[PDB]
Design a protein around this ligand. Structure first.
Ligand SMILES: [K+]
Length: 304
């Protein structure tokens, strides 16, 4: 077989897919990446692939340089530039994307965070035929994976990055054989995974400990969930749920121990394990107690 491919991508999520193309018999003619370096640029250089870094793909020059490549297909993974209509019609197999959700669920920029935040028990990868809309293209293939209550967005990101590489490669093979079954997106099931707004990262202590814990997981490593302590913002990096009833109001301190800073939520208890005060390194519950223990009064203190 062997296809001629232009690859476009920037952050670490894209690397495994690029590496899979590099390790295959397909020919990666060029790699497009953010101007300066990205993880993608590094792997391109290590493998003798020409590196193109336009600031914009609407510019006449850059647009025609791309369409003039004579690739069979363009593969796009986490690329920051919008692809112009001509770019999309440039190659016979079009532009194919590796999207980190099970479309039509979680179209948009933050599908990993949003899936975890919602308590989805599974998510996955969709290989998508790109068009001029936002993640509305036909789905060439899907592969699902479980989300565990242990997973942060970082963990899920890494898992999906590998699944995406394998699926993309398998899909390009079926795509050149003409063995792929298109799945048009069911608009009724479509949901949008927009970027996490800062206010969304604020912990609402009235919510269930279970809901807050999902927020803490979803938002690690960005933007990190946060609450307030002694008038100052406090980022919560690691937490766990304790399914025990309290008489205390939401946000009220239950107990402070090396095992965690236990806080009453609207139901159950959230236990803080790793946290961060302004301009300070992230610290354990034990460290925090050593520094600020005199301000930790069970039944009185109050977070948020
Ligand atoms: K190759």
């Amino acid at each position: 077989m062997s296809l001629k491919i232009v690859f476009a991508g920037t952050p670490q999520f894209a690397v495994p897919t690029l590496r899979a193309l590099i390790d295959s018999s397909h020919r990666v003619l060029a790699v497009y990446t953010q101007p300066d370096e990205s993880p993608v640029k590094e792997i391109a250089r290590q493998n003798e692939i020409p590196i193109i870094q336009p600031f914009s793909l609407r510019d006449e020059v850059e647009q025609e340089k791309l369409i003039a490549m004579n690739a069979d297909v363009m593969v796009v993974v986490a690329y920051g530039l919008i692809l112009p209509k001509k770019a999309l019609n440039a190659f016979r197999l079009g532009c194919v994307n590796v999207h980190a959700s099970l479309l039509p669920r979680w179209r948009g920029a933050a599908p990993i965070q949003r899936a975890i935040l919602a308590g989805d028990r599974e998510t996955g990868i969709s290989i998508m035929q790109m068009n001029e809309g936002l993640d509305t293209g036909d789905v060439l293939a899907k592969s699902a994976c479980v989300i565990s209550s242990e997973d942060t967005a970082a963990d899920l990101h890494d898992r999906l990055s590998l699944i995406g590489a394998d699926l993309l490669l398998e899909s390009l093979a079926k795509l050149e054989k003409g063995d792929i079954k298109l799945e048009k997106q069911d608009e009724a099931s479509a949901t949008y995974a927009s970027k996490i707004q800062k206010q969304e990262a604020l912990i609402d202590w009235r919510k269930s400990a279970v809901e807050i814990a999902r927020q803490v997981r979803a938002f690690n490593p960005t933007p990190i969930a946060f609450t307030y302590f002694e008038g100052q913002p406090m980022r919560i990096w690691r937490a766990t749920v304790v399914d025990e009833k309290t008489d205390f109001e939401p946000g009220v301190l239950v107990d402070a121990d090396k095992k965690g800073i236990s806080i009453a939520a609207g139901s159950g208890i959230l236990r803080l394990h790793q946290l961060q005060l302004p301009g300070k390194r992230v610290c354990s519950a034990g460290d925090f107690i050593n520094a600020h223990g005199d301000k930790l009064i069970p039944g009185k203190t109050v977070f948020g």
